[PDB]
Amino acid sequence: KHNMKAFLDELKAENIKKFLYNFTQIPHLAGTEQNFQLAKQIQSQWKEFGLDSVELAHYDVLLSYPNKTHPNYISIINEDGNEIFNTSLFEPPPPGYENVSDIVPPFSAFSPQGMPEGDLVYVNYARTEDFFKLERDMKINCSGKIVIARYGKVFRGNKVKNAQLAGAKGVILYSDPADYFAPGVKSYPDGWNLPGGGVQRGNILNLNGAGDPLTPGYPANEYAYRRGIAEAVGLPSIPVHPIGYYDAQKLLEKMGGSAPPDSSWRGSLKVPYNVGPGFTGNFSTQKVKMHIHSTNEVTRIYNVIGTLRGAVEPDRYVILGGHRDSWVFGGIDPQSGAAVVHEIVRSFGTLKKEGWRPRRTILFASWDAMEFGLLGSTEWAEENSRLLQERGVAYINADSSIEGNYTLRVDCTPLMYSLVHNLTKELKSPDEGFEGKSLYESWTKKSPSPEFSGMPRISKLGSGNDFEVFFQRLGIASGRARYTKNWETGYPLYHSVYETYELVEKFYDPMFKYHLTVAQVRGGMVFELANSIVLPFDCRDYAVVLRKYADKIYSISMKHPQEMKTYSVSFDSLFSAVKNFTEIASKFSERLQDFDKSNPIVLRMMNDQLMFLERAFIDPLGLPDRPFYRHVIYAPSSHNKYAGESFPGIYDALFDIESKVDPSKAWGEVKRQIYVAAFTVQAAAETLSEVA
Amino acid sequence: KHNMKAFLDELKAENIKKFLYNFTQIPHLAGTEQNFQLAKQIQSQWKEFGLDSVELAHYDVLLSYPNKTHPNYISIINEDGNEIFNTSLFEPPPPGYENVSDIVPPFSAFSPQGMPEGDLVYVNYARTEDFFKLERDMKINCSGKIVIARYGKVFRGNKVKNAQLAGAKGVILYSDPADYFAPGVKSYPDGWNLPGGGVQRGNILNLNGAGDPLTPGYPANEYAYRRGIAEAVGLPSIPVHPIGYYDAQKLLEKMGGSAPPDSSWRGSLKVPYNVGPGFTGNFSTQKVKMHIHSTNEVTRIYNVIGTLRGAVEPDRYVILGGHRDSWVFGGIDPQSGAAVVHEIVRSFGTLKKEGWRPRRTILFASWDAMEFGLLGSTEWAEENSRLLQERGVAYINADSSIEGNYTLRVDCTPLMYSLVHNLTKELKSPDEGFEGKSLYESWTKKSPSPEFSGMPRISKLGSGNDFEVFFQRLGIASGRARYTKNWETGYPLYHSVYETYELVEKFYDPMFKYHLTVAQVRGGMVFELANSIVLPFDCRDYAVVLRKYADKIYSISMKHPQEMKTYSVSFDSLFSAVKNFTEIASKFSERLQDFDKSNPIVLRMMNDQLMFLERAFIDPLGLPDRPFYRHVIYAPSSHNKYAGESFPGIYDALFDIESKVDPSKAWGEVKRQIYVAAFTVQAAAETLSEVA
Ligand SMILES: *[C@@H]1O[C@H](CO)[C@@H](O[C@@H]2O[C@H](CO)[C@@H](O[C@@H]3O[C@H](CO[C@H]4O[C@H](CO)[C@@H](O)[C@H](O)[C@@H]4O)[C@@H](O)[C@H](O[C@H]4O[C@H](CO)[C@@H](O)[C@H](O)[C@@H]4O)[C@@H]3O)[C@H](O)[C@H]2NC(C)=O)[C@H](O)[C@H]1NC(C)=O
Ligand SMILES: *[C@@H]1O[C@H](CO)[C@@H](O[C@@H]2O[C@H](CO)[C@@H](O[C@@H]3O[C@H](CO[C@H]4O[C@H](CO)[C@@H](O)[C@H](O)[C@@H]4O)[C@@H](O)[C@H](O[C@H]4O[C@H](CO)[C@@H](O)[C@H](O)[C@@H]4O)[C@@H]3O)[C@H](O)[C@H]2NC(C)=O)[C@H](O)[C@H]1NC(C)=O
Ligand SMILES: *[C@@H]1O[C@H](CO)[C@@H](O[C@@H]2O[C@H](CO)[C@@H](O[C@@H]3O[C@H](CO)[C@@H](O)[C@H](O[C@H]4O[C@H](CO)[C@@H](O)[C@H](O)[C@@H]4O)[C@@H]3O)[C@H](O)[C@H]2NC(C)=O)[C@H](O)[C@H]1NC(C)=O
Ligand SMILES: *[C@@H]1O[C@H](CO)[C@@H](O[C@@H]2O[C@H](CO)[C@@H](O[C@@H]3O[C@H](CO)[C@@H](O)[C@H](O[C@H]4O[C@H](CO)[C@@H](O)[C@H](O)[C@@H]4O)[C@@H]3O)[C@H](O)[C@H]2NC(C)=O)[C@H](O)[C@H]1NC(C)=O
Ligand SMILES: *[C@@H]1O[C@H](CO)[C@@H](O[C@@H]2O[C@H](CO)[C@@H](O)[C@H](O)[C@H]2NC(C)=O)[C@H](O)[C@H]1NC(C)=O
Ligand SMILES: *[C@@H]1O[C@H](CO)[C@@H](O[C@@H]2O[C@H](CO)[C@@H](O)[C@H](O)[C@H]2NC(C)=O)[C@H](O)[C@H]1NC(C)=O
Ligand SMILES: *[C@@H]1O[C@H](CO)[C@@H](O[C@@H]2O[C@H](CO)[C@@H](O)[C@H](O)[C@H]2NC(C)=O)[C@H](O)[C@H]1NC(C)=O
Ligand SMILES: *[C@@H]1O[C@H](CO)[C@@H](O[C@@H]2O[C@H](CO)[C@@H](O)[C@H](O)[C@H]2NC(C)=O)[C@H](O)[C@H]1NC(C)=O
Ligand SMILES: *[C@@H]1O[C@H](CO)[C@@H](O[C@@H]2O[C@H](CO)[C@@H](O)[C@H](O)[C@H]2NC(C)=O)[C@H](O)[C@H]1NC(C)=O
Ligand SMILES: *[C@@H]1O[C@H](CO)[C@@H](O[C@@H]2O[C@H](CO)[C@@H](O)[C@H](O)[C@H]2NC(C)=O)[C@H](O)[C@H]1NC(C)=O
Ligand SMILES: *[C@@H]1O[C@H](CO)[C@@H](O[C@@H]2O[C@H](CO)[C@@H](O)[C@H](O)[C@H]2NC(C)=O)[C@H](O)[C@H]1NC(C)=O
Ligand SMILES: *[C@@H]1O[C@H](CO)[C@@H](O[C@@H]2O[C@H](CO)[C@@H](O)[C@H](O)[C@H]2NC(C)=O)[C@H](O)[C@H]1NC(C)=O
Ligand SMILES: O=C(O)CC[C@H](NS(=O)(=O)N[C@@H](CCC(=O)O)C(=O)O)C(=O)O
Ligand SMILES: O=C(O)CC[C@H](NS(=O)(=O)N[C@@H](CCC(=O)O)C(=O)O)C(=O)O
Ligand SMILES: *[C@@H]1O[C@H](CO)[C@@H](O)[C@H](O)[C@H]1NC(C)=O
Ligand SMILES: *[C@@H]1O[C@H](CO)[C@@H](O)[C@H](O)[C@H]1NC(C)=O
Ligand SMILES: [Ca+2]
Ligand SMILES: [Ca+2]
Ligand SMILES: [Cl-]
Ligand SMILES: [Cl-]
Ligand code: NA
Ligand code: NA
Ligand SMILES: [Zn+2]
Ligand SMILES: [Zn+2]
Ligand SMILES: [Zn+2]
Ligand SMILES: [Zn+2]
């Protein structure tokens, strides 16, 4: 039989292992020849695996690279201007790769050039609340200072934005062992911990969903008109560079000025964690000097797009996509995901060769330049936006398959909660102590829902991955799944040269059983979405979460009862819309289960109602000053791109409102956001009403 | 049989006459009790006629009314401040209506209050080119002057915007007999000409598609947050008032300063048409003083929405809509259209009572507050935007059925050209000298295509009517049809108290045969759109017009050959996209005619490709500073809302470019608009490619 069981049984751990090894022997940095060669390889293999068509979609986008003959580094300088300490020019390469060419040294992609000299201020994680504490409570002024911040907690672009708005003239990012060194585990290559010479790469853009900085709204094709750099979206205005903790120790050890305000500001290095500004009395005349010479360059990138045409609804698209470009070897990020996608294509192709076709079209994507701002997925979606918004059923992401070996982690739209519960009940747990038990059972046990006994945790989609354009801009139901660590006990070698095949094979998943389980979850989800007669979405699950989010946003507002009285701030409209959504979704579910099952139009009709429900939460005017974040329920946090925020428009209107100079205007805007949210929820509910 | 013939034969001239009489006995001004009563009447009658549901959709929108106890008027004042001439406080009411209550006196809706005193400048039609001539050629300065402008040529809101930007402190609008008095025809009530005491009402907003000035983007429902007046969209900043030509004679006769620059600046009054500024030497110390006391008020409006549920595709909507609100009696505008809609509903209801149903759902709308800025249609479409953009097949407008008795006038999307040609070949010409011949034959003879021998003229959609939100904001295929005058030989009594049932019955259409013909065209179009198995759109007709528009915009640019060389301005991408559109549409047409006719999915698929083709020309970012004009091919002219402009983004980038101070920046923006247009055309073409 050709059913989901046939598809799932065909997936093999050993194939994922072979593919991972194959994709991780050399660096695949976006815009390089090596990454074009791998694109062409994947194109060829997807054809052989049996897809109907496989094309490269290329774009010319702004990328960023260090100058090979003018290295980036940081110095301590004395009053003579002698550089008495210099940070490393590269990470010590791992065993057996000390002769690999074209390893890009650690840098912050899209940093401007500069050689700023100044006194250091230590800003903890450089979060919004960290700068509030510095400025408001401690009365420390970052204006004209170089800030040093530890990685962690929030996306690094938000740290740089926060540092900029505090008036910093430069940012040094470093990995603190408190955040990137698990107690009792050995450093690479003897364990999975970050060594002191390890450094996390990564872009520091604030794109807010725009894609290529030079072509917001439109694909960066051959005839594109590009903005000048001065008008580009999202570029930092101050120099930025990342370092490891050996180097960070040398910059922090001399820090004077104020003491850390409390213990949440101290990492694990043998230093005081003084906030500064500047060094202690003896070294008070030494300063920190950055040297950044990286250049921004328009460079060609290549997405691989494979199509498996649907037998019945060829004009309905289920998309499985993840990126291919890596900072260096990409042993976890992204090749642990890409190898899983490759094995999924191979399985689907096996069934197709035997005469099977999915009901709906499946599109498979190998995205480029994800590490430089989600550029490949975003430019392709800008090119194909009309096809995607009228035909896109769902998008399943496929970055790193593993970030630990403890349990499953799923982030998705509420529309997929039921699908995920049902699929995981069918799958075998790969976990020790759960042999012969379902993935649902092990997952629920290890990651209980905070709300419901007997169910597992499923999180909101945030951002920082290739689902962003599909979900937050276009309103296509999206989901992701991977294996994760026990958060009670990211990963230490994230975006370092040490992320290698050997890291995965030795320390994370020697038997490739977690990879296989993630292939089963991602592939199983795609199979159902592409093959179920009725789309496998449950609108009632959206109604439940909308009430939770309405309760939450109301509670935030109600911390200001006087102002709500003074400005007549009511949430009644939003609760009314949520109540209506609950009632209409209940009735729609009855019709879906009860409609005449022989009628394909009532079924195309009701499948269209299911497909366009996520779409209904899109506001074509976007959120304030963020035109490409259009989903009214979910946006990336304005304080942390990685985190999702619910009712983001109301949330941002309320954030720090007690500090606004004109409360009447501020609370007016809260009321405006309540109106927009209530309207959008009611409008989405009405898409599920009887159509005429 | 239940076919289009059955539908068409059921329509009766005598019923349209009875309905017109019924709808025109009392004024139906938006926001008044009389207009609510008529809404309730139409709701009741549409139910009795047999529609499945008929509801009122109400909104609370900004309207504008004169102060009943503080009348608007204009004076000439002497240096003592005696008012030696005053304009009329009302139009002399027509015979038999001198006792009708609640006739709103002539006013310019949305004028601010004020009593500005100054010297007059005469600005011809107050068009962009008229102000260019005043300022650039004649060196006349309007700053701090009261401008007097004759109605005609362009929408009055554009005149007021132009006057404002010239620094005018007030605007007087008047009807010149050159533009509103046909030679050899008698004034009302003895003929169809405007008498000297007649005045044209009308709003002077510049909404650019926004709808209610206080709630752009969102319906003005019960919980709406409204902008303050200071932030409202589209309101004029200087006082404005309309007058007739008896009064205009008194204001113009004393005008001094410069002579008219040529004969195109002189109307038909016995005055010099001096541009001013100010009066001749003897009267040089007299000034003009406006007194405007109208108030803006949020007021409830009511749309009637009737539904005839489709038998096969209930989730596909064909909409027939036109407005119900009038300035006074609405004898032509809009009741000649509303009576036609009423008879169309009655016919459809007759077939429905006999057991018939259309294939797709038909929605019928009686819009409110159209005269105050398309407010009723726009607020309803804002409320229902998600349903309309995923389910809207087509919108057929139904304002005034007649503006003359000469021949047919059709403005529509190219997608409907074939439908209109084929339907009119089936219909009987009502014209004298064409008995027994088709409407197509009489129409082609009297209104030949400027491009193609043997075919009739069909114009682009402009704006200024209720199709605007559906077509230019949401991208739903739209059309309109009415009987019109011979443009070789609008209508004189437009928006005056003299627009009555008697005007129509005596002078325009005594036998109601032109009304019946227009009912046949509008109803026939709705019938086909709602009933044809394959939607009756021909994508190849879009390809033909896109090449015409590309040629036209290229020609405009090529008036600047040096600059095109200097800034490397190429139209190659746009011609390439148009060529591709032509090729793909040709192949799609072959599949449509050749596909397996027994396959309803290939048919729903290909019907969806046809429905979403107009949708593909929408840019979600809108046009520059006009977020609600989103169609890249068609926008209302930025110089005249009534006129359509093709490739509006490129057109506006090129307009008056030789006057821009920074040519590099100006031509950069031309290139950006070429990129956006070429991309959008290619993207629309790709929606017609095979789907997978
Ligand atoms: C959740 O779902 C419910 C429906 O189950 C919606 O209920 C609607 O709520 C609105 C209030 O926001 C009601 O609006 C009121 O309508 C009255 C007229 O309604 C009748 O006629 C209309 C046609 O015009 C029909 O649509 C309707 O079926 C009724 O037959 C108005 O008279 C009311 O205005 C008066 O009172 C208010 C309040 O004091 C004043 O501000 C006004 O000045 C005026 O005096 C009012 O506008 C509406 O009738 C309800 N529809 C129903 C019950 O079907 C909720 O709105 C929805 N929630 C959201 C967020 O959309
Ligand atoms: C109208 O329809 C036609 C298709 O019939 C489109 O034609 C495309 O035109 C673009 C130019 O805008 C061509 O782009 C060129 O692609 C080359 C690679 O193409 C091959 O491989 C790709 C995958 O990456 C496949 O998609 C494709 O099928 C080919 O197999 C590039 O090498 C070219 O770049 C080089 O030359 C240019 C020009 O000098 C330089 O600027 C670059 O630096 C580089 O050296 C170029 O990008 C594309 O191949 C054409 N596709 C075809 C023929 O199928 C038109 O674009 C379309 N019109 C519009 C407005 O969309
Ligand atoms: C995840 O799995 C759960 C559990 O299987 C699943 O919920 C179940 O879905 C089925 C199918 O819709 C439900 O069965 C329906 O029950 C009602 C009431 O008993 C019946 O009226 C329905 O009968 C109609 O449809 C049948 C075909 O399904 C026809 O055979 C019949 O002639 C009728 O037309 C129907 O049997 C069942 O109640 C639920 N169980 C629950 C909710 O506990 C859920 O849908 C899955 N989630 C997905 C797929 O996303
Ligand atoms: C306006 O009217 C014109 C004139 O009637 C109309 O164009 C015509 O449309 C018909 C129907 O599509 C065309 O007929 C087709 O001709 C091709 C080539 O000869 C045939 O291959 C097609 O046959 C297929 O489809 C038939 C059903 O229509 C089946 O019976 C058959 O088995 C095949 O599947 C088909 O007969 C005809 O060529 C044109 N005439 C022209 C273009 O001159 C136009 O569509 C109308 N516009 C509308 C409705 O908007
Ligand atoms: C990854 O696997 C691919 C596919 O097997 C290898 O590419 C093949 O290389 C052989 C030998 O050079 C060629 O004959 C084939 O034409 C290639 N197939 C392709 C590109 O489709 C590739 O060598 C492997 N990479 C590594 C690093 O081992
Ligand atoms: C990268 O840095 C190198 C080395 O400093 C730069 O190459 C020099 O450029 C200057 C002019 O800008 C020349 O006068 C030198 O002769 C060059 N030196 C070498 C070693 O080639 C180069 O400008 C930088 N590359 C960039 C900005 O991409
Ligand atoms: C840090 O690196 C800098 C730059 O390479 C070193 O300073 C240079 O040293 C050479 C020879 O001693 C001088 O000729 C250059 O003029 C110096 N350049 C600058 C910018 O200072 C410095 O010696 C290094 N410091 C350490 C501790 O190795
Ligand atoms: C932090 O220090 C800078 C000075 O280095 C302050 O920035 C000044 O702001 C005032 C106006 O508010 C201007 O007159 C100065 O020109 C600014 N200085 C420069 C050179 O930019 C800033 O106000 C301080 N932050 C505090 C304590 O609020
Ligand atoms: C327009 O026609 C309507 C419908 O016939 C008339 O309204 C009817 O009036 C009669 C007598 O007052 C009532 O018995 C009916 O209930 C009304 N029908 C409705 C409102 O549906 C109306 O009087 C006519 N208007 C004019 C000006 O003649
Ligand atoms: C319309 O004009 C009338 C008449 O001038 C205004 O009514 C007067 O309002 C003032 C205060 O604004 C009172 O002191 C007078 O007693 C009122 N007179 C009358 C005749 O009632 C009224 O303000 C205006 N209405 C509006 C603005 O809608
Ligand atoms: C034009 O109308 C104005 C306002 O009604 C008239 O001027 C008023 O006349 C009365 C009595 O003569 C005075 O008490 C008022 O003070 C006047 N008001 C103003 C604002 O001037 C004027 O007489 C009328 N002119 C003509 C030609 O009839
Ligand atoms: C038309 O006349 C007005 C003066 O009445 C001019 O407007 C002035 O513009 C200059 C700056 O360009 C300012 O200094 C004045 O304050 C403005 N006047 C007022 C009172 O607004 C205008 O420039 C003239 N137009 C021409 C001839 O270009
Ligand atoms: O540019 C972006 O939006 C992010 C690009 C890249 N995305 S990622 O894959 O490396 N981010 C993690 C987020 C880490 C976490 O929150 O656990 C992920 O999605 O796995 C980065 O953060 O540099
Ligand atoms: O607010 C608007 O956009 C226009 C409202 C109203 N529309 S209209 O129906 O009166 N305009 C005419 C345009 C007259 C013409 O161009 O022949 C029409 O569409 O018939 C008006 O112009 O005041
Ligand atoms: C793999 O699982 C074991 C058992 O809990 C754990 O001790 C080890 O740290 C895990 N490896 C990684 C890389 O998380
Ligand atoms: C009606 O048609 C006749 C014949 O051409 C024409 O003379 C007359 O002016 C028309 N009436 C109107 C109102 O246009
Ligand atoms: Ca782009
Ligand atoms: Ca509105
Ligand atoms: Cl992922
Ligand atoms: Cl019309
Ligand atoms: Na493109
Ligand atoms: Na609403
Ligand atoms: Zn990454
Ligand atoms: Zn990644
Ligand atoms: Zn009108
Ligand atoms: Zn009208």
Numbering used by the authors:
A (entry chain A), B (entry chain A): 55 to 543, 548 to 750
From the study:
Prostate-specific membrane antigen (PSMA), also known as glutamate carboxypeptidase II (GCPII), folate hydrolase (FOLH1), or N-acetylated α-linked acidic dipeptidase (NAALADase), is a membrane-bound metallopeptidase, featuring two zinc ions in its active site. Importantly, the PSMA is overexpressed on prostate cancer cells and the enzyme thus attracts significant attention as a target for the delivery of imaging and therapeutic agents and continues to serve as an important biomarker of prostate cancer. To identify molecular mechanisms behind markedly different potencies of bisubstituted sulfamides and phosphinates/phosphonates, we solved X-ray structures of complexes between PSMA, a well-studied bimetallic metallopeptidase, and sulfamide-based inhibitors. Structural data showed that while monosubstituted sulfamides coordinate active-site zinc ions via the free negatively charged amino group in a canonical manner, their bisubstituted counterparts adopt an atypical binding pattern divergent from expected positioning of corresponding tetrahedral reaction intermediates.
The N1 functionalization of 9 has a significant negative impact on the inhibition potency, resulting in IC50 values of 103 and 165 μM for 3 and 4, respectively. The use of the hydrolytically inactive PSMA(E424M) mutant was required due to the fact that upon cocrystallization of 3 and 4 with the wild-type enzyme, the inhibitors were hydrolyzed and only the hydrolytic products were observed in the PSMA active site (data not shown). Similar to the PSMA/9 complex, the P1′ glutamates of 3 and 4 are well-defined in the Fo-Fc difference map and they occupy overlapping canonical positions within the S1′ pocket. Interestingly, the placement of the sulfamide functionality differs between the two compounds. In the PSMA/4 complex, the sulfamide function is rotated by 120 degrees. Consequently, the positioning and interaction pattern of the first sulfamide oxygen is identical to that of 3, while the second oxygen atom is rotated to the position of the P1 nitrogen atom of 4, where it is hydrogen-bonded to the catalytic water/OH– (2.7 Å), Asn519 (3.1 Å), and Asp453 (3.2 Å), and at a distance of 3.4 Å from the cocatalytic zinc ion. Finally, the β-carboxylate group of 3 forms ion pairs and the hydrogen bond with Arg536 (3.0 and 3.3 Å) and Ser454 (2.5 Å), respectively, while the γ-carboxylate of 4 is disordered in the structure pointing toward its positional flexibility and the absence of strong interactions with residues of the enzyme. At the same time, given the expected conformational flexibility of 4 in the crystal structure (as witnessed by the weak Fo-Fc peaks for the P1 moiety of the inhibitor), such a rearrangement can be plausible.
